[PDB]
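Sync notes, pocket subgroup
Present: LS, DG
LS reminded everyone that the earlier model was apo-only. Rerun requested with T9A included. Inputs:
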Amino acid sequence: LYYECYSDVSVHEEMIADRVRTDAYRLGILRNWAALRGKTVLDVGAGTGILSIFCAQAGARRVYAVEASAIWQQAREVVRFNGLEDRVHVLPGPVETVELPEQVDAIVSEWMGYGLLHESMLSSVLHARTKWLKEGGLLLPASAELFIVPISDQMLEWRLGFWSQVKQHYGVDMSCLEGFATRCLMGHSEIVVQGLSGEDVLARPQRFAQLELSRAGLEQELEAGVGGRFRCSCYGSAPMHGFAIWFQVTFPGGEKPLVLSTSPFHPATHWKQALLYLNEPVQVEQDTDVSGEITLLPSRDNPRRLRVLLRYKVGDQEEKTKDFAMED
Amino acid sequence: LYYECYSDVSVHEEMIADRVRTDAYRLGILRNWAALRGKTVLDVGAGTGILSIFCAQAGARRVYAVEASAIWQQAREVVRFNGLEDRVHVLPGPVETVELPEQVDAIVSEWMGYGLLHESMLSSVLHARTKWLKEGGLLLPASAELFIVPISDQMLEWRLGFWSQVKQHYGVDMSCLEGFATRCLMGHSEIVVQGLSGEDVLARPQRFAQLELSRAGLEQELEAGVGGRFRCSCYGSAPMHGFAIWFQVTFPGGEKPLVLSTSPFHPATHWKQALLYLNEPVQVEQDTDVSGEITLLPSRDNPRRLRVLLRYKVGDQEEKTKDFAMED
Ligand SMILES: Cc1cc(C)cc([C@@H]2c3cc(C)ccc3NC(=O)CN2C(=O)c2ccc(Br)s2)c1
Ligand SMILES: Cc1cc(C)cc([C@@H]2c3cc(C)ccc3NC(=O)CN2C(=O)c2ccc(Br)s2)c1
Ligand SMILES: Nc1ncnc2c1ncn2[C@@H]1O[C@H](CSCC[C@H](N)C(=O)O)[C@@H](O)[C@H]1O
Ligand SMILES: Nc1ncnc2c1ncn2[C@@H]1O[C@H](CSCC[C@H](N)C(=O)O)[C@@H](O)[C@H]1O
C-alpha cells in the first residue's frame, strides 16, 4: 500500500461487476473482428485493461492502452499475466501528450456518465480522434443518444410520506415535516443519480440529442451545448417528481448495431439514470401533456460547472424554468 | 429552501426509520415514568425533538430541548404541532452556553456513534451533567459498554474473490488483482462502519469498556482513554479479516434495565458495527486463541484524530500492532 485506494477498487469493481456494460463491450468489439483483425487500436483510459484485451481477442495486431493515473500499474500486470505484452502496450500518462509510433485504425473508450469527469473524458477521446485516428477509422462506441421522460420516483414518494407514519408507530405526530423533507429532497438544483424501474416512467421517452462521435467538427460543436425540445402525454394518475435522463451508445456490427442502453426499462447498470427533480410534486392524469426544452452546456471557466437548463410545462400549469449544475 | 439539506434529512430519516433505536428510547423513557412525572429534563441535542416529546408523554413537567444547529426550527414546529409548547421549550444554540432557569432532574441524549462528532457529543453531555444536573439526577441512557470480537466479513470475502471469477464470465484472467484489492480494502488504517450478521462472528464477544455516565470524574478520566485486554477462542475454520467493535447502552427500569444493543446477533440498527481490518486475511481453526489489547484515545490537538490502538495475536503468529484513526 502506497495510497488509500478503498474508493479506487470500488469504481473498477463496479464496472467489472456490471454484466450489461461488460457484455456490451465484449460482444460489441468481437462483432467488429473483421474490421479489427491485423489492425491497430488506441484504448483511451484503459483502467485495468479489459477493453484492450477484448480488442486483442478480436484480432488486433497492436493495442495502445493509455492510462493517466496509478491504475496503469494494474493494467501492465493484467496484460503481462494474460501473455499479451507483445500485442498490448500499456502507456502511462494523459492521451493528450502520449506519443504513438503510428496513426491507429480504431479508438475504443468508456467516457460515458454524469459529471465533469465524463465531460473531460469525452474531450480526451475527441482530442485523440483528431490527433491519432486514421481518415475513416473506427470509434467504439460510434454514437451516443440522450433520452428524457417525466417520472414518479417510488423511493422518493416513500421517503416524503415517512413523516406521516410516525404517529401510528411511536405515538408522536411528525406529519408537519413533509414540507421540510420536500424542500430538502426536491428543492435543490443538483442532478441526482438514482436507479428507477419501468413503472416510475409516466410517458414515452423522447430522444433530445444524438452525437456521431466520428464527426470532424464535434469538439467545436459541443462548445454550444447539446439539447432539444420534447413533448409527451402521460399514461395515468401519478405524482410527477420530475424528469429522468439516460443514454445509449451504439457499436457498429459486421449486421445490426449493438446498443448499450441505460433505460429504466432495461437491465440495471452502474450508470443508473440522472434525475431532475421539480421543486415539489405535480399531480398528472391520463393524457396530461408534458413538454419543454433541455440544454446541456459545457463547463468553460474555473470553477467548472456543467449547466443543465430545463424549461417545462405540465398540463395547464404555467411554463417554469429549473436549472441544475454539476460541480464534480 | 435556504440551504442544501439533502444530507440533512437523510440523517434524521435514518434515526426515525430505526425502530430498534426509536423503541429503545420510547420504552426506556416510559419505564422511568415514576422518576420523571412532575420533574424537569434537559434534552441535549434535541434534533427533530422526538426524545423531548417522549419525556413529556412520560409525565415530565418541563423539558428543555437544546439544539445547536438549524434543525432547531423543525423541533420548534414539531413541539407546537403536538400542543406541547407549554411543557417543552426548544432552545437554540450549544448546550455549553444555554441558560436554564433551574438545575434539572434528568438529562436525555443520543450521543453514541463512531467518530469525532460523537466524541464531541459525549463531551457536550458530560459538560451539561456537571453544569445542570441536580445531585443524584437521572441520565438516559445511564451507562455504555463496548465489545470486540474476531470476524470473517462475508461481503469482503465475495469482493476479494471477485477478480478470480472474470475468466469464467468474460474470458479474461484478472486473478492477479486479488493482491491489489486486498491492499486497497484491508491495508488502510481507517475504521469501516459496516453491518455484519451473527455468522460473521468467529468467537465469544469480549467486553473491553464500561462507562457509568453519572460518575463525577468521567470527563478527566476520558482524557487517558478507554480500553482493555481481551482473549477468546475461535469456533471453527474461517478466513479472519479483523475485529468488530460495537456498543450497548442501558436505561434503568422502574425492574431490570432496558438494553439498546448494536451487536451483529441483534436486529440491525443505523449504527451497524465498527470494523478494524487486518492488513490481510489469517486462517483460523476451532480453538485458535485470539488475544490483544484495544485502546481508544481521545482527540486533543488540531487536526483532531481519535486514535484506535490495537495489538493482537492470532494463534501461533507473532503479536502485531495495527493502529487506526478517525479524522471526521
Ligand atoms: C453519456 C453522455 C452523452 C452525451 C451526448 C453527453 C453527456 C454529457 C455531456 C454534455 C456536454 C455539454 C458535453 C460533454 C458531455 N459528456 C459527458 O460524458 C457528460 N455529460 C453529462 O454529464 C450529462 C448528460 C446528461 C446530464 Br442531466 S449531465 C453524457
Ligand atoms: C458508543 C461509544 C461508547 C464509548 C464508551 C466510547 C465511544 C467512543 C469514544 C471514545 C473516547 C476516547 C471518547 C469518547 C467517545 N465517545 C464516542 O461517542 C465516540 N467513540 C468512538 O468514536 C469509538 C468507539 C469505538 C471505536 Br472503534 S471509535 C463510543
Ligand atoms: N486524458 C486522459 N488520458 C488517459 N487516461 C485518462 C484520461 N482521463 C481519464 N483517464 C482514465 O480513464 C479511465 C476511465 S475508467 C476505466 C475504463 C477502462 N476502459 C476499464 O475497463 O477499466 C480512468 O482510469 C482514468 O484515469
Ligand atoms: N454542543 C451541542 N449543543 C447542542 N446541540 C448539539 C451539540 N452538539 C451537537 N448537537 C446536536 O445534537 C444533535 C444530535 S442528532 C439528533 C438526536 C435527537 N435526539 C433526535 O431525536 O433527533 C444534532 O442535531 C446536533 O446538531
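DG: The CA atoms of residues 7 and 137 of chain A lie 36 Å apart.
LS: Residues A 12, 15, 45-48, 50-51, 66-69, 71, 94-96, 110, 121, 124 surround S-adenosyl-L-homocysteine (ligand 3) (CB under 6 Å).
Action: DG to write up.
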